[PDB]
mmCIF file of C-alpha atoms in Angstrom:
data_model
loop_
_atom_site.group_PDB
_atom_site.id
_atom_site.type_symbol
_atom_site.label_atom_id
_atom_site.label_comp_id
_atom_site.label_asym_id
_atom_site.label_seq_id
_atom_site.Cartn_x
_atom_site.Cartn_y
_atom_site.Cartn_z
ATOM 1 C CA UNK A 1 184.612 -150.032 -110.403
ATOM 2 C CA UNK A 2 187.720 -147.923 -110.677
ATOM 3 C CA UNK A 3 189.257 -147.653 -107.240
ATOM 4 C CA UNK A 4 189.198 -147.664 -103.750
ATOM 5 C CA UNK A 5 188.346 -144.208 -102.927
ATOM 6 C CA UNK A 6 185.068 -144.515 -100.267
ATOM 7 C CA UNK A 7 184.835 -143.567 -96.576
ATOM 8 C CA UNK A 8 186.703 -145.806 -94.013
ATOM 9 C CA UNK A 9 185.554 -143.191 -90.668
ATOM 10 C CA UNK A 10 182.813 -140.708 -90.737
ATOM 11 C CA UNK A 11 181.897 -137.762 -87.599
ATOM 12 C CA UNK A 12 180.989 -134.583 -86.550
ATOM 13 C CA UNK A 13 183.065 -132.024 -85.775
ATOM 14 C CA UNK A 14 181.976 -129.864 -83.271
ATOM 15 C CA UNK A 15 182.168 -126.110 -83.071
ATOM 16 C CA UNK A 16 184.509 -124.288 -80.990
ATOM 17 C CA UNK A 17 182.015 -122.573 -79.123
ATOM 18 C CA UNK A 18 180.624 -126.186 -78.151
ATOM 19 C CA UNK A 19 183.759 -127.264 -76.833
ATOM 20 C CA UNK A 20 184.311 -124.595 -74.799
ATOM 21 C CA UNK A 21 181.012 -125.055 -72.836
ATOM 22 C CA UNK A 22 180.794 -128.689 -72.841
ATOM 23 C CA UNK A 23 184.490 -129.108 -71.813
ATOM 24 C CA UNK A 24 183.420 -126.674 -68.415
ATOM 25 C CA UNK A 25 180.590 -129.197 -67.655
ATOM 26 C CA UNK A 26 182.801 -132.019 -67.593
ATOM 27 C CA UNK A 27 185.053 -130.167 -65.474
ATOM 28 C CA UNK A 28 183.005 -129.501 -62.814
ATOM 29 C CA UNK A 29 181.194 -132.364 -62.788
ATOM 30 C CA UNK A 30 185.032 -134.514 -62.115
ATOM 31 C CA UNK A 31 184.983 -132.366 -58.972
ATOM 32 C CA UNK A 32 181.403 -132.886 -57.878
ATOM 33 C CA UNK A 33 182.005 -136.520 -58.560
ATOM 34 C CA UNK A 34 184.882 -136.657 -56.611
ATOM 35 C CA UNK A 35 183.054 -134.276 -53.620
ATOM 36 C CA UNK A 36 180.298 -137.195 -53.705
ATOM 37 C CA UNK A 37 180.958 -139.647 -50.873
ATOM 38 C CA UNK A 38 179.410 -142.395 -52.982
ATOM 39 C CA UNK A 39 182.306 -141.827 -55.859
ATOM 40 C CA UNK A 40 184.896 -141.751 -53.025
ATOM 41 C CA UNK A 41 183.414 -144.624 -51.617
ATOM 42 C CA UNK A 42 183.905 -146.692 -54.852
ATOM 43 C CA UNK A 43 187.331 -145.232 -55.478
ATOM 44 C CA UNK A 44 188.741 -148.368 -54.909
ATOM 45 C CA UNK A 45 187.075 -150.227 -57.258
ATOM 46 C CA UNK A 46 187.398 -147.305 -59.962
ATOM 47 C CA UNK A 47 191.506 -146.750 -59.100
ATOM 48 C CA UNK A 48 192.059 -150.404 -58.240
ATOM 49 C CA UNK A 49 193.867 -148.871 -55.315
ATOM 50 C CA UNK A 50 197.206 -148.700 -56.816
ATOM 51 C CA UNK A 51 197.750 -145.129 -57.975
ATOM 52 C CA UNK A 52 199.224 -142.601 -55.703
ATOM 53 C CA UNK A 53 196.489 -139.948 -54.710
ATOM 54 C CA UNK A 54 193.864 -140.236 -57.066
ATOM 55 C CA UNK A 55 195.420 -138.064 -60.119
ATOM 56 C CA UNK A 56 194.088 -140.392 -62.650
ATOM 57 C CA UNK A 57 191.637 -137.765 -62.457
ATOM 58 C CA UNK A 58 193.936 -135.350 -63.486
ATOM 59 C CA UNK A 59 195.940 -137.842 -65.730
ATOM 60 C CA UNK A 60 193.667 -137.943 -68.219
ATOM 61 C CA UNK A 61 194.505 -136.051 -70.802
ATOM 62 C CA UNK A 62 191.349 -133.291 -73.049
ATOM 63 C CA UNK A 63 192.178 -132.368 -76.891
ATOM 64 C CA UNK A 64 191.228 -129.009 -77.757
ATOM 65 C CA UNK A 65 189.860 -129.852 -81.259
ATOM 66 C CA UNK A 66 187.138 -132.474 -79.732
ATOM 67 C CA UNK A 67 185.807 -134.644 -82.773
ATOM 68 C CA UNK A 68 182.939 -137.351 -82.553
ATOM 69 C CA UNK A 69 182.491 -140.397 -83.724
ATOM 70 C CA UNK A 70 179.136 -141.577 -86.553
ATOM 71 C CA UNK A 71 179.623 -144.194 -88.752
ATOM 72 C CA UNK A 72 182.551 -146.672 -89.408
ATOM 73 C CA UNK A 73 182.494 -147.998 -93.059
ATOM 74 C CA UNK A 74 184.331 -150.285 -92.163
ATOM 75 C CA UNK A 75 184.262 -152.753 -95.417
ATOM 76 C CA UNK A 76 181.538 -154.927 -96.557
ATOM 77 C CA UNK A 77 180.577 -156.441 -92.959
ATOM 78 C CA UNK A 78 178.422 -153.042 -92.533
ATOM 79 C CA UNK A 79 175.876 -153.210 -94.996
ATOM 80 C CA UNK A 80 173.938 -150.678 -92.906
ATOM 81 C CA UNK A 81 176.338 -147.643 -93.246
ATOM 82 C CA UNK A 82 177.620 -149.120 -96.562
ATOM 83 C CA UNK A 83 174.253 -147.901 -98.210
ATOM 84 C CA UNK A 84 174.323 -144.689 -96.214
ATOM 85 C CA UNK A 85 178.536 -144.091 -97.831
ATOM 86 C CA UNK A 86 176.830 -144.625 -100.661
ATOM 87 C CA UNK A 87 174.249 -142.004 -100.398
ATOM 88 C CA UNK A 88 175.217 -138.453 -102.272
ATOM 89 C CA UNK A 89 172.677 -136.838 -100.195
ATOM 90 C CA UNK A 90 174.731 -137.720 -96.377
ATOM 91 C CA UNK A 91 177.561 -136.817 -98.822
ATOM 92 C CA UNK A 92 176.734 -133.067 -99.392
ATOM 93 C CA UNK A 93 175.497 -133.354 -96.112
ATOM 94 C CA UNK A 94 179.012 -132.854 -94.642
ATOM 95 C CA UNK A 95 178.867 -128.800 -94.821
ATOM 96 C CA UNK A 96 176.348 -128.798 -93.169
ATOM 97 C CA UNK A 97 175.679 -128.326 -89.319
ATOM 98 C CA UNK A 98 173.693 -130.010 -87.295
ATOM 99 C CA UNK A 99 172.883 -129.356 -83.455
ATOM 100 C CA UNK A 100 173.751 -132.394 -81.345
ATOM 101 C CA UNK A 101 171.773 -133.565 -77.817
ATOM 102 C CA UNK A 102 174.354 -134.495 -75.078
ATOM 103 C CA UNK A 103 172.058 -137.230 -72.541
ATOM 104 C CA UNK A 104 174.760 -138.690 -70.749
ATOM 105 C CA UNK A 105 178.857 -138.521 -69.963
ATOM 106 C CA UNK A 106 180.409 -141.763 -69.223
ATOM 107 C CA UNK A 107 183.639 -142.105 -67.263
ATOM 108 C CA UNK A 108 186.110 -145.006 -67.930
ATOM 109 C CA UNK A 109 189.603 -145.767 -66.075
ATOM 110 C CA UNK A 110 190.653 -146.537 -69.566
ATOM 111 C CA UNK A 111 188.813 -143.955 -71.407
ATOM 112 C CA UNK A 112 186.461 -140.547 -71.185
ATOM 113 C CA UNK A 113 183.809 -140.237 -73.580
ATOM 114 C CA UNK A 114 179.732 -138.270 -73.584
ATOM 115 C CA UNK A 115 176.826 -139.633 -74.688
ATOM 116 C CA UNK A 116 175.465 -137.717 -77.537
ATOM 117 C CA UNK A 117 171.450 -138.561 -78.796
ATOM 118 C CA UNK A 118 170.967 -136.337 -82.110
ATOM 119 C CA UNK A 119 167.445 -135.516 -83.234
ATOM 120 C CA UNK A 120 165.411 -137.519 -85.240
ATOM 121 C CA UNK A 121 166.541 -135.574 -88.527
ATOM 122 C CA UNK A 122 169.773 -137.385 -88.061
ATOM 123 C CA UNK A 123 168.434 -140.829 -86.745
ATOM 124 C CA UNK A 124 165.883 -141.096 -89.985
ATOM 125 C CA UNK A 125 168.739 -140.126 -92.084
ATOM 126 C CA UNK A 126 171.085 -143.147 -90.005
ATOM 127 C CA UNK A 127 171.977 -146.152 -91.832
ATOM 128 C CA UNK A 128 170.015 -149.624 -90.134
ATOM 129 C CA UNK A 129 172.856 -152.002 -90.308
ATOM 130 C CA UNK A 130 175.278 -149.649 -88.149
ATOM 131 C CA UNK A 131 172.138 -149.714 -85.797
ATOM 132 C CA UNK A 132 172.993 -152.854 -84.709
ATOM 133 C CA UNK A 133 175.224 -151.295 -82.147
ATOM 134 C CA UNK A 134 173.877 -151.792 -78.378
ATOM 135 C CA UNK A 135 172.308 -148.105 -78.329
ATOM 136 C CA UNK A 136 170.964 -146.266 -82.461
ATOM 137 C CA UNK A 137 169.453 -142.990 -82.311
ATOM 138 C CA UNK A 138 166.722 -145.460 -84.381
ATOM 139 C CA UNK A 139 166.246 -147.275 -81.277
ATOM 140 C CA UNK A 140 164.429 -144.451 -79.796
ATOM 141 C CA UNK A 141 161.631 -146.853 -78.214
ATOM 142 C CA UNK A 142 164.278 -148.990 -76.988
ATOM 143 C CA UNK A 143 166.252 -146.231 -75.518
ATOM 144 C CA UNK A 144 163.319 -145.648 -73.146
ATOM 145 C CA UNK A 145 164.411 -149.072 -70.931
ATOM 146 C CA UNK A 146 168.073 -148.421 -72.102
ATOM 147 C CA UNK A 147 170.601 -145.275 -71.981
ATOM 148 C CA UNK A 148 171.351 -143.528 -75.136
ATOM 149 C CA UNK A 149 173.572 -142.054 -76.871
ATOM 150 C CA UNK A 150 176.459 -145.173 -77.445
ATOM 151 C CA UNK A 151 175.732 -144.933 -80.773
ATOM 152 C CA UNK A 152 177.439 -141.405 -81.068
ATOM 153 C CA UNK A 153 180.210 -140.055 -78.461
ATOM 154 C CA UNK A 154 182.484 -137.696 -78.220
ATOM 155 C CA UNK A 155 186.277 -138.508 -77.347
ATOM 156 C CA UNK A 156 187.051 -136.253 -74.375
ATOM 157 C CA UNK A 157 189.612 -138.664 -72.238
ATOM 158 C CA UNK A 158 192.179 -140.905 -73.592
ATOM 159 C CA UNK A 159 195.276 -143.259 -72.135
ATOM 160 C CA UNK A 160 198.469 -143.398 -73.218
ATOM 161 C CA UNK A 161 198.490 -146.849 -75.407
ATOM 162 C CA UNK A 162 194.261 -147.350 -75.979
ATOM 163 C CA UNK A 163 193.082 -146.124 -79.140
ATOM 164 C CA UNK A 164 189.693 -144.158 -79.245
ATOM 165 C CA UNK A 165 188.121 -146.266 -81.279
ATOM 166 C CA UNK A 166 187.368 -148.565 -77.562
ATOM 167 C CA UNK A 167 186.036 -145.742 -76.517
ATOM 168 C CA UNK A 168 183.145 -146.059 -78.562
ATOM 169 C CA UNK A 169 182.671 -149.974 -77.870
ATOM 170 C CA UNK A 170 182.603 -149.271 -73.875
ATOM 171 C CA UNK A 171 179.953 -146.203 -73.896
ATOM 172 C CA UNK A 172 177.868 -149.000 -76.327
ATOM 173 C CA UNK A 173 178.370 -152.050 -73.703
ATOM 174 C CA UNK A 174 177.392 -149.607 -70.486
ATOM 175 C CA UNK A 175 174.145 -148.802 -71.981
ATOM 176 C CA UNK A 176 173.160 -151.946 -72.536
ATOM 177 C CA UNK A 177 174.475 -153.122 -68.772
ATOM 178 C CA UNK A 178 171.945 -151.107 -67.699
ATOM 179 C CA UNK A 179 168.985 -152.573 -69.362
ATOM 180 C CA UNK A 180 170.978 -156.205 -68.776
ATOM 181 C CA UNK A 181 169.369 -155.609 -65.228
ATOM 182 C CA UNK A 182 172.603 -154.941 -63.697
ATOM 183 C CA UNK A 183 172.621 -150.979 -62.427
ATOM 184 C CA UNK A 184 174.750 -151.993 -59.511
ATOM 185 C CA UNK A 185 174.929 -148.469 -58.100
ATOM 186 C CA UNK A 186 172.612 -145.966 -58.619
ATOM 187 C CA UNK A 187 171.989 -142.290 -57.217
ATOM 188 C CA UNK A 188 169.521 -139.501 -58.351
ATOM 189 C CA UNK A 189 170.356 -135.730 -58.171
ATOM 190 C CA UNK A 190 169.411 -132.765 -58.890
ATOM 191 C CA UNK A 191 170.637 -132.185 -62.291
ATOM 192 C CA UNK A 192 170.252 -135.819 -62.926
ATOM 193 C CA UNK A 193 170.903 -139.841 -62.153
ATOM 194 C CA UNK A 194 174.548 -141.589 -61.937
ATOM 195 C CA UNK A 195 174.674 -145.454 -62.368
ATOM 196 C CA UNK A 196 177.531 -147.527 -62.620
ATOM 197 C CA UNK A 197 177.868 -151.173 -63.820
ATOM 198 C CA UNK A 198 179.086 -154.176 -61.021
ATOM 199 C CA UNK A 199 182.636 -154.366 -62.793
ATOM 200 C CA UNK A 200 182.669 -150.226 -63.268
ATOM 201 C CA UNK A 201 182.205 -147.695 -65.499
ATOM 202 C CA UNK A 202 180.348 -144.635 -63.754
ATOM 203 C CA UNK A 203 178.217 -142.186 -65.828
ATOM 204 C CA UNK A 204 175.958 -139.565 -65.212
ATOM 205 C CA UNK A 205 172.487 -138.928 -67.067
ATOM 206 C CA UNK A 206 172.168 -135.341 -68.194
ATOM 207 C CA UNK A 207 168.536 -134.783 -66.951
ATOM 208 C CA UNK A 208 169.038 -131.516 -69.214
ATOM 209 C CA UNK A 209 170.217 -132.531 -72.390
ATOM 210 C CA UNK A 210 172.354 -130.005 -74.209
ATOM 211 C CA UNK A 211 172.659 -129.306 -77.461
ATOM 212 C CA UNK A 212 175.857 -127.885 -79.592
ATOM 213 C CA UNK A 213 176.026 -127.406 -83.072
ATOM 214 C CA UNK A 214 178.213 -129.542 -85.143
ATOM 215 C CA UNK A 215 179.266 -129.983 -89.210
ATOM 216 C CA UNK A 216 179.325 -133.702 -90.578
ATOM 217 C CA UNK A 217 183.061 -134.269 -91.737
ATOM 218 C CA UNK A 218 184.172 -137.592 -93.860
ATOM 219 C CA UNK A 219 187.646 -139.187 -93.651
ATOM 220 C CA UNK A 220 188.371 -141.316 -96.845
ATOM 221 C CA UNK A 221 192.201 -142.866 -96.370
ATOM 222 C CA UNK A 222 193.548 -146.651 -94.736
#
């Protein structure tokens, strides 16, 4: 070789315009969600009753410039996504911009983060060994008895002293609570379904999926 100049962190960014209406659904949906008797009536369990008034709501904290997450290089551990870094063609492909699916939004007292399914443009052009993550936009079938959209999230809510990178890992592990047979709670509405795993996490399936479009960006530094 010569030296170590490939990927470490690979996303999309999304557009401004994106942003701007995603950011408004997420909004109002932390005030239906706290309207809803059944959030309220988990409160405890979410807060841990020991906060104040329930501002955790309000303490989390929404960048403007929202970025998402794809593919972690990583190393060598990754062979998956290691072929795909190593592909000219995803490469090039950064320019480009591609229009991404939200399905779900997950809420975490640690974290906030959406579930974001891409077409199948992106999932044929998805490395398998990253796949290997509780919910691929390859696992498609699967994804029918499983949520979707773990695979790629976008980092809306963070804490002060978690990195966002356990973001990702959580939206991964609630999808596949679900099809664990868990789905403790569970409510269907009108725009769509809320389920929350026995320990926590609460997120709510976009019946209406919505898409935003997005240009792949690359990130090559330790």
């Amino acid at each position: 070789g010569s030296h170590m100049e490939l990927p470490l962190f690979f996303g999309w960014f999304l557009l401004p315009e994106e942003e701007e209406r995603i950011k408004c659904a997420t909004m109002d949906f932390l005030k239906t969600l706290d309207t809803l008797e059944a959030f309220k009536e988990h409160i405890s369990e979410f807060t841990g009753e020991a906060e104040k008034e329930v501002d955790l709501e309000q303490y989390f904290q929404n960048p403007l410039q929202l970025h998402c997450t794809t593919k972690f290089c990583d190393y060598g551990k990754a062979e998956g996504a290691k072929e795909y870094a190593e592909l000219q063609v995803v490469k090039e492909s950064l320019t480009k911009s591609y229009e991404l699916s939200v399905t779900a939004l997950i809420v975490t007292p640690r974290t906030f983060g959406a579930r974001v399914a891409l077409t199948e443009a992106q999932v044929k052009l998805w490395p398998e060994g990253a796949d290997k993550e509780g919910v691929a936009p390859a696992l498609l079938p699967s994804v029918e008895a499983l949520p979707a959209g773990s695979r790629a999230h976008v980092t809306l809510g963070c804490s002060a002293g978690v990195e966002t990178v356990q973001t990702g890992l959580d939206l991964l592990e609630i999808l596949a609570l679900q099809k664990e047979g868990k789905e403790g709670t569970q409510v269907e509405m009108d725009l769509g379904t809320l389920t929350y795993l026995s320990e926590g996490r609460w997120f709510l399936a976009l019946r209406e999926p919505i898409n935003a479009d997005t240009t792949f960006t690359s990130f090559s530094e330790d």
